[PDB]
Amino acid sequence: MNGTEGPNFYVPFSNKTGVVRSPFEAPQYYLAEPWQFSMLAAYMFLLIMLGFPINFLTLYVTVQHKKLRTPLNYILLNLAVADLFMVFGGFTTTLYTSLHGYFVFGPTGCNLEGFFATLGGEIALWSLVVLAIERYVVVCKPMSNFRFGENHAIMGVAFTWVMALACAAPPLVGWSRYIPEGMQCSCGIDYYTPHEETNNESFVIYMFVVHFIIPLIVIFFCYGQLVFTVKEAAAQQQESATTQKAEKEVTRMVIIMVIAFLICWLPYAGVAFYIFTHQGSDFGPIFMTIPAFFAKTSAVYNPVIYIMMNKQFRNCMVTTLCCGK
Amino acid sequence: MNGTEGPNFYVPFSNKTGVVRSPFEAPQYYLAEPWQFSMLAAYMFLLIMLGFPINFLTLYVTVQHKKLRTPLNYILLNLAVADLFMVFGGFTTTLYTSLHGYFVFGPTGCNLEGFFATLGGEIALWSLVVLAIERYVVVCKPMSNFRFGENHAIMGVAFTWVMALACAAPPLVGWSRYIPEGMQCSCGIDYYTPHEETNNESFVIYMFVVHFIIPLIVIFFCYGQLVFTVKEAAAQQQESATTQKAEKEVTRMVIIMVIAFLICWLPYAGVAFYIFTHQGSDFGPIFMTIPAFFAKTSAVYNPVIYIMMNKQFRNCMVTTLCCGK
Secondary structure (H helix, E strand, O other), X not given: OOOOOOOOOOOOOOHHHOOOOOOOOOOOOOOOOHHHHXXXXXXXXXXXXXXXXXXXXXXXXXXXXXXXXOHHHHHHHHHHHHHHHHHHHOHHHHHHHHHHOOOOOOHHXXXXXXXXXXXXXXXXXXXXXXXXXXXXXXXXOOOOOOOOOOOOOHHHHHHHHHHHHHHOOHHHHOOOOOEEEOOOOEEEOOOOOOOOOOOOHHHHHHHHHHHHHHHHHHHHHHXXXXXXXOOOOOOOOOOOOHHHHHHHHHHHHHHHHHHHHHHHXXXXXXXXXXXXXXXXXXXXXXXXXXXXXXXHHOHHHHHHHHHHHOHHHHHHHHHHOOOOO | OOXXXXXXXOOOOOHHHOOOOOOOOOOOXXXXXXXXXXXXXXXXXXXXXHHHHHHHHHHHHHHHOOOOOOHHHHHHHHHHHHHXXXXXXXXXXXXXXXXXXXXXXXXXXHHHHHHXXXXXXXXXXXXXXXXXXXXXXXXXXXXXXXXXXXXXXXXXHHHHHHHHHHHOOHHHHOOOOOEXXXXXXXXXXXXXXXXXXXXOHHHHHHHHHHHHHHHHHHHHHHHOOXXXXXXXXXXXXXXXXXXXXXXXXXXXXXXXXXXXXXXXXXXXXXXXXXXXXXXXXXXXXXXXXXXXXXXXXXHHHHHHHHHHHOHHHHHHHHHHOOOOO
């Protein structure tokens, strides 16, 4: 056959060889050599360290600074909160799996793995819509006295949260499940089999048609309505105003932001298409594993772009660095 | 017997078991389980990342800043140079060894490993003497118009360099050798055997009695002559002068610096004593391996203490961070 099947695992290699044994108990050096295995482990601790201290620093900075209550501060504060939950309940069990080659917890650890991965991805993707609509408002001006505060901004964060605890949880109860992908070292969603028992096919369609292309195209047509008035050909300040210069700053920032997110997240499910619709001829392990694990660096590069161009936020950073001036 | 012997390796485990085979070709999961092995690999990439970018940043900072030509800038610039050479020609082959369990290069890679380890340690240890004598001069005042510049400071860096290329090189030619220690994953100097063929015993004595205790006690008696006039019980500025306040700043900094170096480097050869003089009863693997690899974090925490208290150097850092102001 064109792979290998199990009740909680799918090795992407033919069991006609007669070597596939218990993967959640045994290591899996016979699917792939241990050199790229240890490479992936090191590449995970990479993001663990590069996340933790900058995250805690940005948390304490925005905790101390009662000067910036523009809602983007709130957005990248609660994104940082979700990323704290991610780095605690996320990469540590993946690194233990890459340490031993399997969840010693068994499917319990695999269920713990995806409990924050797709959740964090969902927050990081849908949160950029809430600011996109804001930028469109400040550019097109349907109102005159409108601005976002304690009764226009936190509602969008609650939107992202209530979809986060409605898009990440449903596989936990049996409408979907978790199955190891990649080198069978990362638990996600199946594309290898229909598996009508847990109702995955309708679940996979319900996930893709709701969460992937629709907010994507709302973002693209917000960008399809953000090339006329304010110009990407930047020369210097004072196009219209100084707060509008800050608008232009955040505009170019979010353009490069969503472009980086595109470059990251395109092949992640671009290969899942080929695995889902077209199964039966054959497929490759490097064909799928590499582009999916390209995208595990997503939230870690969200604070640094906020350091890149935001001027006075960087002033807050460099002031409260030594906690002096 | 009380261990296991070879022509280029010494497994710290009895070969009466009848399992010791080629270590430089085979992995060594049968000496110790692979969990702490992968732990050590991750703990190496830890220091690799935590070294590289801060090192390049400090290099370019001191390259741009023609404002601070006080010699401590030169000292921690050329220490950073030696650390660039270290992180290039050092931890990468150790991480490859921890990736595969052995030098694929064979003894060539093991010889490449120690070519910068003891060299970097020698520079980091002896360089702190050159500033210690300086602080003692500024505290005791034998002269009146004396200060360190382009003809008093670089001579000390040349001292450290000419001992660096006289203390690290001699094992390369046959007066000593390199042999894997720890989990047999780190090449250093033997304490398990006399091995009179390559003349190690006289070499080990010549190393310890010259490089370890003598500069150590010169440092301690410089500290034995640095508790009377300027006081560690600090209250605020203006004890004598503002440049003398900078002297007090660097004084407390170097006190904590050498104390941290003491805490790091004490057991590293404190266990080598027990292995060298007392061999024949038995010894433990955790007895030696843990305290030696505690000390592999030495140079990486040298820039951050320079960030800790140095005020205007930190001003140079935060100014040239964005390359503006």
